[model samples]
Target: ALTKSQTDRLEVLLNPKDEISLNSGKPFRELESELLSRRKKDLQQIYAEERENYLGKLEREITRFFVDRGFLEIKSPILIPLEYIERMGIDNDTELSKQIFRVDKNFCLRPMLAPNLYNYLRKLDRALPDPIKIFEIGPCYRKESDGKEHLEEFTMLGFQQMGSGCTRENLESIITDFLNHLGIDFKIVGDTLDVMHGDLELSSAGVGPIPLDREWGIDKPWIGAGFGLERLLKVKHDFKNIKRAARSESYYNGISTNL
Candidate 1:
């Protein structure tokens, strides 16, 4: 996907601590200027109304989707203890240890809702019936490299199932049914039996094997699915011929975020 020109420019952009400049070895300002210039259009553009409407519609549909399956939706904190990330090795060899978001405590903005959702499941202690299905959707944060798809802050939906009755078929049924109800048919675009991690690495490290795996089962284990709202919106904007979709600036360059 990288063009030769972009690649040439990127070689200079990648190493910020280097000293190559027009005058007295001051490249930081030049880099900062380039960064600001790059985002000028996106910063100026606003589709507040469209974005709000999109979010509202998604909320209603998602709530119905979860409720119909008897899955209770609970809100988890946007911040968590560093120990969780440490235990999972997500923060291994990173600056997370030094950065404290609050007074005398190193808390981080959650990158996904799964860990917090798992926290709730851990408290239940198996007494809360046969199938404890739950779903949560919330904002998450991350430090991202440059790309239209890689937003530093975005929303995430997390779902989990625990109990003897939980099965892969049940989970797939939920996903397919929900998509069908929305009149969206996905071709799946891969080997039918292909097992792959998503962009966000949709797995729970605490669970074992593929972090998202719920039980001790090897074949039929728990799975996680994540849909970028922007990607879905872009699909609608393109296929549905919606003209008001906002244009992507950096990588997607004039392509709608919803497409």
Candidate 2:
């Protein structure tokens, strides 16, 4: 019942070196290298889809947590003026200065979200509620040393609560609760907490009642913290490399499926 072309196709799949036979008749099919090729491709497609789906779910939960707690999410510019970096004590000779990705002598991609958040706080400080709580999630740039924990471009989730009596302990409690709600196991060592998976510390949390706050014109007490999004994802899923959870040209769904 099969055409000559269909029989010939089976011949190529079986053994191109020998005579082909539709053994036992009824036009039998043969396993080809194409089967394995398609299997690998299908596996990657499913993994990629699942990765995106989970990332979306996590983002939604995080956003909802902040929004429910009276924290207003805001946007900030990625390219910032040099004065912002200077305000944070990064000068020409400082160690952090060298890591900055400069667009020119005066402008650079922001390494942190705090400075821009401070700018907005300055404008809306008095106009908004006391203990002004605001946050931003965006990509930050740094020429970090190549390592599993470092990425030149990475996502940052940062927030600040500014007003009288905004204690570091209070901020820590809120962060602990947030992470706990997400089922993230962490350990507090002194004043900082390490979000852990196995032996790897995926994210570090700290309160900056920093001396540089004065330079930013924040006269009152304040508390701030930042977390790396890719790091969070890496720890959440136990990925081998941070790149698998971050923006990359290769690897997806925690799999090295790319050529």
Candidate 3:
């Protein structure tokens, strides 16, 4: 015989259809099963709503961070010429070479937004003031065959500060403060830092003024960094698949919540 408190607890566990007669014997297992089902339903709703809300918040925060720093946001085309990729030093023999999606055997979907920025800057560098800064958020394609970290088509956040007086430390400071504001857990790894949450590496941030700048015809000192938005969202929310945080048809919220 259960006490009043025990009986009250059992009432919550009992399904609505299962009429409860406290005096009559009822199996504890059936009550427990009903309780579990209710719990799962509640969790599913919470996750979907949470994911949808957070995705919008993430975009706002990112845009605001850049705008406050005097960075101009721009859009670039997804279609790219093969010449642009080659100019960036991706040779025909490299592994990334094969992964490029070619159209008409000449043009390819851009693998990165860097080339577009580089081209635009090259043409406008002389007209713009020193420390020309710009950024873009867009989708990039790759035939990624690796594990979950790589997505076939993923969103990229790329920024460049070209012209005189741009330094690597300045780039690091920009990225570091931005991450700090987001309350992201990360550590510097070589020239780039990995945004980490426990065992998973969510995304990476690195600055450049490397020799590759010469390839872009960038003579002056400059610095830039790129990040994966979906990766950041995945890590922030403790999601299993990156697609959950990206544009998807299957899962509505956070990609993990099947809605």
lDDT of 2 by residue, 66-183 (tens): 8888888888899999778888888888878889988988899999898898887777796987878888888899998878877889888887778865776787787788778887
Candidate 3 per-residue lDDT, tens place, 1-259, comes to 6677766555544333344566656565565455557656755777666544555667778888998898888788898888888888899788888889888877999888889988777877878777788888888898987666678888788888877646656766887887888877766455455546566664555555677878888776667777877788777665556766767754444422321
TM-score of 1: 0.57
Error at 219, model 2, angstroms: 0.9
Model 2 misplaced regions, further than 4 Å: 1-57, 191-209, 257-259
Residues 1-259, model 1: lDDT tens digits? 4445644453433323334443334454565455445444443453432334554466567877887878787888887775556554455367543332332366777766656766666565446774567778766666655653455556666677666555556656666676567655454323032212233222222221263334322222244454544444434433221122223242222222321
Q: Which candidate is the best by TM-score?
A: 2
Best by lDDT: 3
Q: How many backbone clashes does candidate 2 have?
A: 0
TM-score for each predicted model, relative to the true structure: 0.57, 0.75, 0.74
Q: Give the whole-model CA lDDT for all candidates, comma-separated.
A: 0.50, 0.70, 0.71
Query: In terms of TM-score, which candidate is stronger, 1 or 2?
Result: 2
Instruction: Kindly give the stretch of ten consecutive residues in candidate 1 with the minimal lDDT sum.
Output: 239-248
lDDT of 2: 0.70
Error of 1 at 13 (Å): 29
